[PDB]
Amino acid sequence: MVISINQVRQLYVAKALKANTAALTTAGDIVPKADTAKTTLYFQSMSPAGIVASDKINLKHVLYAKATPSEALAHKLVRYSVTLDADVSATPVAGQNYILRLAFRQYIGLSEEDQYFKYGEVIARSGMTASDFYKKMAISLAKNLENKTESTPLVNIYLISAAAASTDVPVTSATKESDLTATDYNQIIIEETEQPWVLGMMPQAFIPFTPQFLTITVDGEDRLWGVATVVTPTKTVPDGHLIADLEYFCMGARGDIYRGMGYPNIIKTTYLVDPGAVYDVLDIHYFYTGSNESVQKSEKTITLVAVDDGSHTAMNALIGAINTASGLTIATL
Amino acid sequence: MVISINQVRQLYVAKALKANTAALTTAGDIVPKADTAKTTLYFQSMSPAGIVASDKINLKHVLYAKATPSEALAHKLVRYSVTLDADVSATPVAGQNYILRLAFRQYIGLSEEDQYFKYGEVIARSGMTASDFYKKMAISLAKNLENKTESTPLVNIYLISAAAASTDVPVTSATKESDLTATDYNQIIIEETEQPWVLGMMPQAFIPFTPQFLTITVDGEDRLWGVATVVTPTKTVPDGHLIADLEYFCMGARGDIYRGMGYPNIIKTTYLVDPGAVYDVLDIHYFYTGSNESVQKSEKTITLVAVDDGSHTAMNALIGAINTASGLTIATL
């Protein structure tokens, strides 16, 4: 995952916070060092091959410093609630074919011009109610979408029982309608899924979607049979696949830019981000100006990531160690 | 002396801290002047031809302001102790010629490639005491050194008796063995010497050396007969000659730069530093920035020298008058 830079950006994983240079013993330790005059801030840390210090931040030449929680960096998956249009008919009219076109927009390619469509179809019956429609619609959608031998999963299908109204009933291709026994179904939730991820090589990306409806002949009138509204999101993609890509890039500004290229003839870098753990990010953005005529700024930033467990314990202690050393006023998340 | 500049260096001599203007009547007086809003700072000082005000320091643009205690600018004359070590022999071997070579560097030229060697030799006898060897080695050094009819020698050779242990007997080319009457001389002191100095033309320099020994053979093996240990220095060169050379260079950034070139047709610059008094120094380093395109900095520095009474009362009064008027907090020494 290549990112943009204002100028060079360095990341330091804060796996443990110490109070001296001498206490740095394990890979992932950190200590914010400063003066007693508070004119220079740097971060001594323990690399996987020894102690390494960061750049020296002039505390007069800081632009901003802000700390971002984990839930700010968690992607909310988009949900769409597919119902029958009550103006058209609240019950399925008999003998009509109910086809639904899910329009994917950023399928495999990177643009909106690379598009993809998955269909679901139900021909309504004489005694088919609304819940028996949503049952057969979601069985037909999951049969087309969530086959096992697809290339990537696209969306998740969930019925909702009107008695429950807050618990998602998962519908897959292996699901039969013998398993779906509830008689009060009021919507079909279609919700996007998390794509695969390889660190550095495949970034975190999502394929957005919209459900679209073909018209039915209701009373001699070609009316589109349903409406699709976007309900509030109830799931989040965690921060871990985003920070490990943020470390894989920012370990070439310190380390090797040739990552893997002539394969046995490489330096291999040890990365201290566990991709299955959430992190909080602190961005100290600062600059350098020269003596007399070298007044152009070299605006750069030093990133710090700390793993946090619910309440942000390790980041608020990191900020509290920076604020007493630097004299800064970084706000605590 | 020629020193480097950060585009300028201005020097003003402080002789009496007057409280305001129209109290400056004698040459050397100074008042630190600033406005009520503490935006600009300057010094109105009585030059030997009238009141002169310094360049105005924008107090938003002060890079550093720090003062020097005048003990940190005094050079220590290095002492070396020459002794017969107990490992080879603590008594002079009866047949061996003991030669002590003094290896100078930065002799007349300016490099360590200009080396000068002076010698001192004693051939020992059967009944020679280790105390009588140090009397003869110091005199044999004081004949090869201290032979200059022109000037003071490159080193001064002293003798400590073990009964005294803190008062050094001086050994000159006039000194014979009848004058040294003690029986317990235990070491030889080879001390540095202050070189000549003339104002503005000959800078203050020193000639470093190393007492080196030639091999004698005692237990069949050629062993170095002595040990040269650097004693902590007991003699200093005061801060007079460096400040007088500092005022000489930095009064050409304000006055005449032709300091005696076409010799009858010259402008005489009256200097206020006498070279026989110690001086505390106070450096204030500021810059200038212009508007809308001229964002380049014109860094400057203003030097203030004040005579030392040992308890630093003249500089601490000058610092405390600045901190009241300017609002900066310069650390009192």
Short mmCIF file of all heavy atoms in Angstrom, two decimals, chain A residues 138-191:
data_model
loop_
_atom_site.label_atom_id
_atom_site.label_comp_id
_atom_site.label_asym_id
_atom_site.label_seq_id
_atom_site.Cartn_x
_atom_site.Cartn_y
_atom_site.Cartn_z
N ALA A 138 -33.55 -14.32 -1.11
CA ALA A 138 -32.24 -14.43 -0.49
C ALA A 138 -31.59 -15.78 -0.76
O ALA A 138 -30.36 -15.88 -0.76
CB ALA A 138 -32.33 -14.19 1.01
N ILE A 139 -32.39 -16.83 -0.96
CA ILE A 139 -31.84 -18.11 -1.39
C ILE A 139 -31.29 -18.00 -2.80
O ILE A 139 -30.21 -18.52 -3.11
CB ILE A 139 -32.90 -19.22 -1.26
CG1 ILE A 139 -33.19 -19.53 0.21
CG2 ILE A 139 -32.51 -20.49 -2.01
CD1 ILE A 139 -32.12 -20.33 0.91
N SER A 140 -31.97 -17.25 -3.66
CA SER A 140 -31.52 -17.07 -5.04
C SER A 140 -30.34 -16.11 -5.14
O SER A 140 -29.50 -16.27 -6.03
CB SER A 140 -32.66 -16.55 -5.90
OG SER A 140 -32.16 -15.99 -7.10
N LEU A 141 -30.26 -15.13 -4.24
CA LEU A 141 -29.12 -14.21 -4.25
C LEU A 141 -27.86 -14.90 -3.76
O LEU A 141 -26.80 -14.77 -4.37
CB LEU A 141 -29.43 -12.99 -3.38
CG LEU A 141 -30.21 -11.86 -4.03
CD1 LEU A 141 -30.67 -10.88 -2.97
CD2 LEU A 141 -29.34 -11.18 -5.06
N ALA A 142 -27.96 -15.64 -2.66
CA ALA A 142 -26.79 -16.32 -2.11
C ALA A 142 -26.34 -17.49 -2.99
O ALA A 142 -25.17 -17.87 -2.94
CB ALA A 142 -27.08 -16.80 -0.69
N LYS A 143 -27.25 -18.05 -3.78
CA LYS A 143 -26.86 -19.10 -4.72
C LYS A 143 -26.00 -18.54 -5.84
O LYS A 143 -25.09 -19.22 -6.33
CB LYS A 143 -28.10 -19.79 -5.30
CG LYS A 143 -28.54 -21.02 -4.54
CD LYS A 143 -29.75 -21.65 -5.18
CE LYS A 143 -30.11 -22.95 -4.48
NZ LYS A 143 -29.86 -22.86 -3.01
N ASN A 144 -26.28 -17.31 -6.26
CA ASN A 144 -25.50 -16.69 -7.32
C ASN A 144 -24.23 -16.05 -6.76
O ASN A 144 -23.14 -16.27 -7.29
CB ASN A 144 -26.35 -15.65 -8.05
CG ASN A 144 -27.59 -16.26 -8.66
OD1 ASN A 144 -27.55 -17.36 -9.21
ND2 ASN A 144 -28.70 -15.56 -8.57
N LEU A 145 -24.37 -15.27 -5.69
CA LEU A 145 -23.24 -14.55 -5.13
C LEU A 145 -22.25 -15.45 -4.41
O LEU A 145 -21.09 -15.56 -4.82
CB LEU A 145 -23.73 -13.48 -4.15
CG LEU A 145 -24.45 -12.31 -4.79
CD1 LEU A 145 -25.45 -11.76 -3.81
CD2 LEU A 145 -23.44 -11.26 -5.19
N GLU A 146 -22.69 -16.09 -3.34
CA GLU A 146 -21.77 -16.83 -2.47
C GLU A 146 -21.63 -18.29 -2.85
O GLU A 146 -21.77 -19.17 -1.99
CB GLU A 146 -22.21 -16.69 -1.01
CG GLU A 146 -22.00 -15.30 -0.43
CD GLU A 146 -20.53 -14.95 -0.24
OE1 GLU A 146 -19.73 -15.86 0.05
OE2 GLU A 146 -20.18 -13.76 -0.38
N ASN A 147 -21.34 -18.59 -4.11
CA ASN A 147 -20.84 -19.91 -4.45
C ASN A 147 -19.42 -20.06 -3.91
O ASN A 147 -18.70 -19.08 -3.72
CB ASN A 147 -20.86 -20.12 -5.97
CG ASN A 147 -20.25 -18.96 -6.72
OD1 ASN A 147 -20.02 -17.89 -6.16
ND2 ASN A 147 -19.99 -19.16 -8.01
N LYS A 148 -19.03 -21.31 -3.62
CA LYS A 148 -17.74 -21.54 -2.98
C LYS A 148 -16.59 -21.27 -3.95
O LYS A 148 -15.55 -20.71 -3.55
CB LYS A 148 -17.66 -22.97 -2.44
CG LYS A 148 -16.33 -23.31 -1.77
CD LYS A 148 -16.06 -24.80 -1.76
CE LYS A 148 -14.63 -25.10 -1.32
NZ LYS A 148 -13.64 -24.25 -2.02
N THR A 149 -16.77 -21.59 -5.23
CA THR A 149 -15.71 -21.48 -6.22
C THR A 149 -15.71 -20.15 -6.96
O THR A 149 -15.31 -20.10 -8.13
CB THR A 149 -15.79 -22.63 -7.22
OG1 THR A 149 -17.05 -22.58 -7.91
CG2 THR A 149 -15.66 -23.96 -6.51
N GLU A 150 -16.15 -19.07 -6.32
CA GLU A 150 -15.96 -17.75 -6.90
C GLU A 150 -14.51 -17.30 -6.69
O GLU A 150 -13.72 -17.94 -5.99
CB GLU A 150 -16.92 -16.74 -6.28
CG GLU A 150 -16.66 -16.41 -4.81
CD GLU A 150 -17.86 -15.77 -4.13
OE1 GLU A 150 -18.31 -14.71 -4.60
OE2 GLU A 150 -18.37 -16.34 -3.15
N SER A 151 -14.15 -16.19 -7.34
CA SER A 151 -12.80 -15.66 -7.17
C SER A 151 -12.64 -14.92 -5.84
O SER A 151 -11.67 -15.14 -5.12
CB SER A 151 -12.43 -14.76 -8.34
OG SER A 151 -13.46 -13.84 -8.63
N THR A 152 -13.59 -14.05 -5.52
CA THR A 152 -13.64 -13.31 -4.26
C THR A 152 -15.08 -13.20 -3.80
O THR A 152 -15.98 -13.11 -4.64
CB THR A 152 -13.04 -11.90 -4.36
OG1 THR A 152 -13.50 -11.25 -5.56
CG2 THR A 152 -11.54 -11.92 -4.29
N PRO A 153 -15.33 -13.19 -2.49
CA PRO A 153 -16.68 -12.86 -2.01
C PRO A 153 -17.01 -11.40 -2.29
O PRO A 153 -16.13 -10.54 -2.29
CB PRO A 153 -16.59 -13.13 -0.50
CG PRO A 153 -15.13 -12.97 -0.19
CD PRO A 153 -14.43 -13.54 -1.39
N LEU A 154 -18.28 -11.14 -2.55
CA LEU A 154 -18.73 -9.82 -2.96
C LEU A 154 -19.57 -9.14 -1.89
O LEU A 154 -19.21 -8.07 -1.41
CB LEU A 154 -19.51 -9.92 -4.27
CG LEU A 154 -18.64 -10.28 -5.48
CD1 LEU A 154 -19.50 -10.76 -6.62
CD2 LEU A 154 -17.81 -9.10 -5.89
N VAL A 155 -20.68 -9.76 -1.48
CA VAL A 155 -21.56 -9.21 -0.45
C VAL A 155 -22.10 -10.36 0.39
O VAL A 155 -22.12 -11.51 -0.03
CB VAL A 155 -22.74 -8.39 -1.03
CG1 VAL A 155 -22.31 -7.00 -1.46
CG2 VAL A 155 -23.35 -9.12 -2.18
N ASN A 156 -22.54 -10.02 1.60
CA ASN A 156 -23.20 -10.96 2.49
C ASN A 156 -24.70 -10.69 2.49
O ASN A 156 -25.14 -9.54 2.47
CB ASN A 156 -22.67 -10.83 3.92
CG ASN A 156 -21.31 -11.47 4.10
OD1 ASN A 156 -20.49 -11.00 4.87
ND2 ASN A 156 -21.08 -12.56 3.38
N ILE A 157 -25.49 -11.76 2.53
CA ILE A 157 -26.94 -11.68 2.52
C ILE A 157 -27.46 -12.07 3.90
O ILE A 157 -27.03 -13.08 4.47
CB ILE A 157 -27.55 -12.59 1.43
CG1 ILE A 157 -26.86 -12.35 0.09
CG2 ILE A 157 -29.04 -12.37 1.32
CD1 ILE A 157 -27.24 -11.06 -0.59
N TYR A 158 -28.38 -11.27 4.44
CA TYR A 158 -28.96 -11.51 5.76
C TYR A 158 -30.44 -11.21 5.72
O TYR A 158 -30.84 -10.07 5.44
CB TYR A 158 -28.30 -10.66 6.84
CG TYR A 158 -26.81 -10.81 6.96
CD1 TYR A 158 -25.96 -9.76 6.67
CD2 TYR A 158 -26.25 -12.00 7.40
CE1 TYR A 158 -24.60 -9.89 6.78
CE2 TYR A 158 -24.89 -12.15 7.52
CZ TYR A 158 -24.07 -11.09 7.21
OH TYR A 158 -22.70 -11.22 7.32
N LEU A 159 -31.26 -12.21 6.01
CA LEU A 159 -32.66 -11.96 6.31
C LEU A 159 -32.80 -11.38 7.71
O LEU A 159 -31.93 -11.56 8.57
CB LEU A 159 -33.47 -13.25 6.21
CG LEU A 159 -33.54 -13.85 4.81
CD1 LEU A 159 -34.15 -15.24 4.85
CD2 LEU A 159 -34.35 -12.93 3.95
N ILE A 160 -33.90 -10.67 7.94
CA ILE A 160 -34.27 -10.23 9.28
C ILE A 160 -35.69 -10.70 9.56
O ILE A 160 -36.60 -10.48 8.75
CB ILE A 160 -34.14 -8.70 9.45
CG1 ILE A 160 -32.70 -8.36 9.83
CG2 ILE A 160 -35.12 -8.15 10.49
CD1 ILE A 160 -32.50 -6.93 10.28
N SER A 161 -35.87 -11.39 10.68
CA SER A 161 -37.20 -11.72 11.16
C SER A 161 -37.81 -10.50 11.83
O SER A 161 -37.13 -9.79 12.58
CB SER A 161 -37.16 -12.90 12.12
OG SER A 161 -38.46 -13.24 12.57
N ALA A 162 -39.09 -10.25 11.56
CA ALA A 162 -39.76 -9.08 12.12
C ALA A 162 -39.97 -9.19 13.62
O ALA A 162 -40.15 -8.16 14.28
CB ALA A 162 -41.09 -8.86 11.41
N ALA A 163 -39.97 -10.40 14.17
CA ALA A 163 -40.04 -10.56 15.62
C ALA A 163 -38.71 -10.21 16.27
O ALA A 163 -38.68 -9.61 17.35
CB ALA A 163 -40.47 -11.98 15.98
N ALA A 164 -37.60 -10.59 15.64
CA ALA A 164 -36.28 -10.29 16.18
C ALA A 164 -35.89 -8.84 15.90
O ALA A 164 -35.57 -8.09 16.83
CB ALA A 164 -35.24 -11.25 15.60
N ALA A 165 -35.84 -8.47 14.62
CA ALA A 165 -35.65 -7.13 14.06
C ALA A 165 -34.25 -6.55 14.29
O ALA A 165 -33.97 -5.45 13.79
CB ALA A 165 -36.68 -6.11 14.57
N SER A 166 -33.37 -7.23 15.01
CA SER A 166 -32.01 -6.75 15.20
C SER A 166 -30.96 -7.84 15.08
O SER A 166 -29.77 -7.53 15.22
CB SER A 166 -31.88 -6.05 16.56
OG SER A 166 -32.40 -6.86 17.60
N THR A 167 -31.34 -9.09 14.84
CA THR A 167 -30.40 -10.19 14.69
C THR A 167 -30.42 -10.64 13.24
O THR A 167 -31.48 -10.94 12.69
CB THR A 167 -30.76 -11.35 15.61
OG1 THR A 167 -32.01 -11.91 15.20
CG2 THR A 167 -30.87 -10.88 17.05
N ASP A 168 -29.24 -10.68 12.62
CA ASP A 168 -29.13 -11.03 11.22
C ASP A 168 -29.22 -12.54 11.05
O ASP A 168 -28.54 -13.29 11.76
CB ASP A 168 -27.80 -10.52 10.66
CG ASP A 168 -27.78 -9.02 10.51
OD1 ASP A 168 -28.80 -8.37 10.81
OD2 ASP A 168 -26.73 -8.48 10.11
N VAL A 169 -30.07 -12.99 10.13
CA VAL A 169 -30.20 -14.40 9.81
C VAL A 169 -29.33 -14.68 8.59
O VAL A 169 -29.70 -14.27 7.47
CB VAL A 169 -31.66 -14.78 9.54
CG1 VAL A 169 -31.77 -16.24 9.16
CG2 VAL A 169 -32.51 -14.50 10.76
N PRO A 170 -28.18 -15.35 8.74
CA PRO A 170 -27.26 -15.49 7.61
C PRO A 170 -27.75 -16.50 6.59
O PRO A 170 -28.15 -17.61 6.94
CB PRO A 170 -25.95 -15.94 8.28
CG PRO A 170 -26.38 -16.60 9.53
CD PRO A 170 -27.63 -15.90 9.98
N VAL A 171 -27.74 -16.10 5.32
CA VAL A 171 -28.16 -16.94 4.21
C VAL A 171 -26.96 -17.17 3.31
O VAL A 171 -26.37 -16.21 2.79
CB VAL A 171 -29.32 -16.30 3.43
CG1 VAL A 171 -29.70 -17.18 2.27
CG2 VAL A 171 -30.50 -16.09 4.33
N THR A 172 -26.59 -18.43 3.13
CA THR A 172 -25.48 -18.82 2.27
C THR A 172 -26.02 -19.70 1.14
O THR A 172 -27.22 -19.95 1.04
CB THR A 172 -24.40 -19.54 3.06
OG1 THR A 172 -24.99 -20.57 3.86
CG2 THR A 172 -23.67 -18.57 3.97
N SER A 173 -25.11 -20.17 0.29
CA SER A 173 -25.51 -21.04 -0.80
C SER A 173 -25.85 -22.44 -0.31
O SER A 173 -26.68 -23.13 -0.91
CB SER A 173 -24.42 -21.11 -1.86
OG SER A 173 -23.25 -21.71 -1.35
N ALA A 174 -25.23 -22.87 0.79
CA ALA A 174 -25.55 -24.15 1.39
C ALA A 174 -26.85 -24.12 2.19
O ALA A 174 -27.37 -25.18 2.54
CB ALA A 174 -24.41 -24.60 2.30
N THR A 175 -27.36 -22.93 2.49
CA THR A 175 -28.59 -22.80 3.26
C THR A 175 -29.79 -23.25 2.43
O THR A 175 -29.96 -22.82 1.28
CB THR A 175 -28.78 -21.35 3.71
OG1 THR A 175 -27.59 -20.91 4.38
CG2 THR A 175 -29.95 -21.23 4.66
N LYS A 176 -30.60 -24.13 3.01
CA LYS A 176 -31.89 -24.50 2.45
C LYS A 176 -32.98 -23.70 3.14
O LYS A 176 -32.77 -23.14 4.22
CB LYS A 176 -32.14 -26.00 2.62
CG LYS A 176 -31.17 -26.89 1.87
CD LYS A 176 -31.56 -28.35 1.99
CE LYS A 176 -31.27 -28.87 3.39
NZ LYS A 176 -31.56 -30.33 3.51
N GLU A 177 -34.15 -23.65 2.52
CA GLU A 177 -35.28 -23.00 3.17
C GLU A 177 -35.95 -23.88 4.22
O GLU A 177 -36.87 -23.42 4.90
CB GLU A 177 -36.31 -22.54 2.14
CG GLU A 177 -37.02 -23.65 1.39
CD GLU A 177 -37.95 -23.10 0.33
OE1 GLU A 177 -37.98 -21.86 0.15
OE2 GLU A 177 -38.67 -23.90 -0.31
N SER A 178 -35.51 -25.13 4.36
CA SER A 178 -35.86 -25.92 5.54
C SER A 178 -35.22 -25.35 6.79
O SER A 178 -35.76 -25.51 7.89
CB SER A 178 -35.44 -27.37 5.34
OG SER A 178 -36.13 -27.96 4.25
N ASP A 179 -34.06 -24.70 6.65
CA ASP A 179 -33.41 -24.05 7.78
C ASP A 179 -34.07 -22.74 8.15
O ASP A 179 -34.07 -22.35 9.32
CB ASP A 179 -31.93 -23.81 7.47
CG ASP A 179 -31.14 -25.10 7.35
OD1 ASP A 179 -31.52 -26.10 7.99
OD2 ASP A 179 -30.13 -25.12 6.61
N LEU A 180 -34.64 -22.04 7.17
CA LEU A 180 -35.28 -20.74 7.38
C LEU A 180 -36.77 -20.99 7.62
O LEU A 180 -37.54 -21.15 6.68
CB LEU A 180 -35.06 -19.83 6.18
CG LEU A 180 -33.61 -19.70 5.73
CD1 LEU A 180 -33.52 -19.17 4.32
CD2 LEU A 180 -32.85 -18.81 6.69
N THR A 181 -37.16 -21.03 8.90
CA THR A 181 -38.51 -21.41 9.28
C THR A 181 -39.38 -20.26 9.75
O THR A 181 -40.58 -20.46 9.92
CB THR A 181 -38.46 -22.47 10.40
OG1 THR A 181 -37.79 -21.92 11.54
CG2 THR A 181 -37.71 -23.70 9.93
N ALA A 182 -38.81 -19.08 9.98
CA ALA A 182 -39.58 -17.95 10.48
C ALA A 182 -40.53 -17.43 9.41
O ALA A 182 -40.20 -17.39 8.22
CB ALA A 182 -38.65 -16.83 10.94
N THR A 183 -41.73 -17.04 9.84
CA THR A 183 -42.80 -16.66 8.93
C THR A 183 -42.98 -15.15 8.81
O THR A 183 -43.87 -14.72 8.07
CB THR A 183 -44.12 -17.29 9.37
OG1 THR A 183 -44.48 -16.80 10.66
CG2 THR A 183 -43.99 -18.81 9.43
N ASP A 184 -42.20 -14.35 9.52
CA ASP A 184 -42.32 -12.90 9.47
C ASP A 184 -40.97 -12.29 9.08
O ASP A 184 -40.20 -11.84 9.92
CB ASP A 184 -42.83 -12.35 10.82
CG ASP A 184 -42.12 -12.96 12.02
OD1 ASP A 184 -41.27 -13.86 11.81
OD2 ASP A 184 -42.41 -12.55 13.16
N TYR A 185 -40.71 -12.25 7.78
CA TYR A 185 -39.53 -11.61 7.22
C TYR A 185 -39.95 -10.30 6.58
O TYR A 185 -40.93 -10.26 5.84
CB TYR A 185 -38.85 -12.52 6.19
CG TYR A 185 -38.14 -13.71 6.79
CD1 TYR A 185 -38.12 -14.92 6.12
CD2 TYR A 185 -37.50 -13.62 8.01
CE1 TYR A 185 -37.47 -16.02 6.66
CE2 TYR A 185 -36.85 -14.70 8.56
CZ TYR A 185 -36.84 -15.90 7.88
OH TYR A 185 -36.19 -16.98 8.42
N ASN A 186 -39.21 -9.23 6.87
CA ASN A 186 -39.58 -7.91 6.39
C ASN A 186 -38.54 -7.23 5.52
O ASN A 186 -38.87 -6.22 4.89
CB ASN A 186 -39.92 -7.00 7.58
CG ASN A 186 -38.84 -6.99 8.64
OD1 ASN A 186 -37.81 -7.64 8.50
ND2 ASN A 186 -39.08 -6.26 9.72
N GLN A 187 -37.32 -7.75 5.44
CA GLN A 187 -36.29 -7.14 4.60
C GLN A 187 -35.22 -8.17 4.28
O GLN A 187 -35.14 -9.23 4.89
CB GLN A 187 -35.65 -5.92 5.28
CG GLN A 187 -35.34 -6.12 6.74
CD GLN A 187 -35.08 -4.81 7.45
OE1 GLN A 187 -34.27 -4.00 7.00
NE2 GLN A 187 -35.78 -4.58 8.55
N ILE A 188 -34.41 -7.83 3.28
CA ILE A 188 -33.21 -8.56 2.92
C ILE A 188 -32.05 -7.60 3.05
O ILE A 188 -32.00 -6.59 2.34
CB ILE A 188 -33.28 -9.12 1.49
CG1 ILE A 188 -34.58 -9.86 1.26
CG2 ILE A 188 -32.11 -10.03 1.22
CD1 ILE A 188 -34.94 -9.95 -0.18
N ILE A 189 -31.12 -7.89 3.95
CA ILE A 189 -29.94 -7.05 4.10
C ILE A 189 -28.82 -7.59 3.22
O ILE A 189 -28.48 -8.78 3.29
CB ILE A 189 -29.51 -6.94 5.57
CG1 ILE A 189 -30.44 -5.99 6.30
CG2 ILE A 189 -28.06 -6.48 5.69
CD1 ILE A 189 -30.13 -5.84 7.74
N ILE A 190 -28.29 -6.72 2.37
CA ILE A 190 -27.12 -7.01 1.56
C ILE A 190 -26.00 -6.12 2.07
O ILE A 190 -26.17 -4.90 2.17
CB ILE A 190 -27.40 -6.76 0.07
CG1 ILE A 190 -28.77 -7.35 -0.30
CG2 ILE A 190 -26.33 -7.38 -0.78
CD1 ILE A 190 -29.13 -7.22 -1.75
N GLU A 191 -24.87 -6.72 2.41
CA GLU A 191 -23.80 -6.03 3.11
C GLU A 191 -22.47 -6.43 2.51
O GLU A 191 -22.22 -7.62 2.31
CB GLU A 191 -23.81 -6.36 4.61
CG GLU A 191 -22.73 -5.67 5.41
CD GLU A 191 -22.39 -6.40 6.68
OE1 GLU A 191 -22.17 -7.63 6.62
OE2 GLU A 191 -22.34 -5.75 7.74
#
